Design a protein around this nucleic acid. Sequence first.
DNA 1: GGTGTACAAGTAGGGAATGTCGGTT
DNA 2: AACCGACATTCCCTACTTGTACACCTGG
DNA 3: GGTGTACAAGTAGGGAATGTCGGTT
DNA 4: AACCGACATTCCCTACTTGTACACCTGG
DNA 5: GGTGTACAAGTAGGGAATGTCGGTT
DNA 6: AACCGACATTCCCTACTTGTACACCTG
Lengths: 336, 336
Amino acid sequence: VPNKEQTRTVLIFCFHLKKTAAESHRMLVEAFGEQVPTVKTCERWFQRFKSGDFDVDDKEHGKPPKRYEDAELQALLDEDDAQTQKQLAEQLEVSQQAVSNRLREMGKIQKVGRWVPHELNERQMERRKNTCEILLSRYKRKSFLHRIVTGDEKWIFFVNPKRKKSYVDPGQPATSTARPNRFGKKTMLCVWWDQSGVIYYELLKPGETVNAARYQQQLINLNRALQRKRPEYRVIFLHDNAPSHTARAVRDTLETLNWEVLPHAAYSPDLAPSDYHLFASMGHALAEQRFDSYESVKKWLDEWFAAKDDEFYWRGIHKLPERWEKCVASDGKYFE
Amino acid sequence: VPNKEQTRTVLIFCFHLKKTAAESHRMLVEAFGEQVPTVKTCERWFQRFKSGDFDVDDKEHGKPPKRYEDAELQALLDEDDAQTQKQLAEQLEVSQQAVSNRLREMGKIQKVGRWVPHELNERQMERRKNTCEILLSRYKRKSFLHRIVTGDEKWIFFVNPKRKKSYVDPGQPATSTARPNRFGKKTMLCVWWDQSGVIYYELLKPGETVNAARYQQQLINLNRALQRKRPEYRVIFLHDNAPSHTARAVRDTLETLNWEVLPHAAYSPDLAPSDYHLFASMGHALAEQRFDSYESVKKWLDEWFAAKDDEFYWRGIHKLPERWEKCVASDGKYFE
DNA sequence: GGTGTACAAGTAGGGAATGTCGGTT
DNA sequence: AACCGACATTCCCTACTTGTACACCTGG
DNA sequence: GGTGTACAAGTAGGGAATGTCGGTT
DNA sequence: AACCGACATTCCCTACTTGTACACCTGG
DNA sequence: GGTGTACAAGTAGGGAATGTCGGTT
DNA sequence: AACCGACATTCCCTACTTGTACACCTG
Ligand SMILES: [Mn+2]
Ligand SMILES: [Mn+2]
């Protein structure tokens, strides 16, 4: 009856009764019948038993040689880590299924890259690196974030649907969503805030623009609202290089307010707290959220800003230095 | 130095040597030592040996109870098959991790749903059903497909990048891509085709628009090219309800050419061979493609439309029949 | 409309695990 | 009888293969 | 910033697997 | 001695738990 | 975002309708 | 008073323009 495993047990038991090899074998036929391993394989078990080898496991078997080294497929990734299996395959003379396996066998996983706002010129980066160095230099001499009042502009549609993920048996349809229309109803939000909260915001009506003209009016209203909400206020103002924000007219509206405008490189939303922090948070919050009327957008926004904590804003602003640092370490290339 | 499995082999060995249960135990202690099991076990083993049962492995142990039933979790999916695990867990009173497991244990996988072009109206679904019904009723009677000349219009940006997928160790990042610009240079393409190939295409200059005026012009230009390339043509025209396609003026330009316009319910790009099949194949081929010159866009298209085997277009058109059935059986809801 | 990844199942080798057998004591 | 060495036979485990399912793309 | 899934590791508890022991022959 | 039945003790295997990593999101 | 059709409302124009004026008995 | 033709206005009624909905195709 017994298998190589059950057999070796016996031969250990037979070993421990001082039975000789050939003796044990006789007992096996006596016990189980003719169909028991040959004497030769008893003599063998015995020969290793005498060494303290009662190790049950077969010694490691034979294996077809790997038709390509690990470090070989690894060094292909070292040139272009974003190739398909089929592409790697035809460089290693194996199938894709083969390249499927060895990538699973090595620690490797497949992950999808980041979208970055803009392709940056050899120069575009230099400007970033500079600004970031400049601000850090200042940051070390004296913390000044406590003086920062930034703000920016962000669309808010009346419907924000996301593609839905369904848990269902294989080869079945996942509940589907209807596209967000590119030319749907939307209202521009313009919001200004500081490390202690949101100072002032305007929610523009559907078709409304922001021009050198209106921008002025706004930061004068901001000023008015600043006077009451921030009594202690000099003051530092951070905003991106909108065609509207660099307006000859507006530049002067800032001088005549005695506001210091922190330098800001273009295509750098990763350095604008309004974008990388405030809005980013709102992005999550707006998911699948509907707005029937312009009134409710303002009501949601109102309760949304209000129901934030204090630290939330504080944290947004104080992550600047960390970003300026990366912004330099990454040498101007996006760092996010 | 035996285990709760190895000793059982031995007890089988002794059973088949006509040794008494207690006798065998005395042999166990003699051979191995003092850490063998009791005689009480040997007696028990023997008692099941005396039957024909020499099955080594245990009986199934005591296991905790299931806190909810597989089919009870199934009722939640029947309601809403797209729910986060956390949400299911709450309804079941178990943890998320708990549900992560029972979904693994059941057949269930996670799938991303579709983007359907437009949210359809109780009415718009009927329009679709009918039109599909009508055309199919006819196709059954007499195949009118080889007479179908159809066309549409589709943008083509000068840079078509895709997020890149990388094979990498966990934690390490994947190569990032610069985002496609919504406002980049983009030439419009107006193309008309037929079961045997493309008849006449018109690649517009950047700014160029299509109005009641220009559409007519093209329809005539089409006809001329149709006379020499398709020397046999009466023509059936298929085109979507673009405001330009549905102008008073144009319907008359179509009459003057004597073309049967097939009815085509609004919001039905899934029934326009131009979109659902020709541009579809294009979207793939256009991936990661850069176009520096307007000439190359034409040079690309020329060589592309050309190298396309004749059947390709044939299949495109002949897939209408099944889309109609499918459009019909699904009562007008989208069906892709 | 195309394409990319992984589960199936089959297959060839590389040796171990085993057997055979003539040689020793 | 007992055990051995050497060459032959059997078996086991893996790195591949082709075949295939299928998630997700793609045009709106 | 925010959140959704799964790999770790620990824990209870339900019985089997095993032990203990005085009762039979 | 041998084996038993009955009650006690130990051990094994799982369905959960909490803790945590981390892909991917989110603003541009 | 582009674009066309369908009325709903808002200006002009050739007609009217009415007004002014000369004439004659 | 009576009455005309000859023009000049005060208006309409229709008639060309705008103005203000929608409707349909792209991502
Ligand atoms: Mn901005
Ligand atoms: Mn179209």
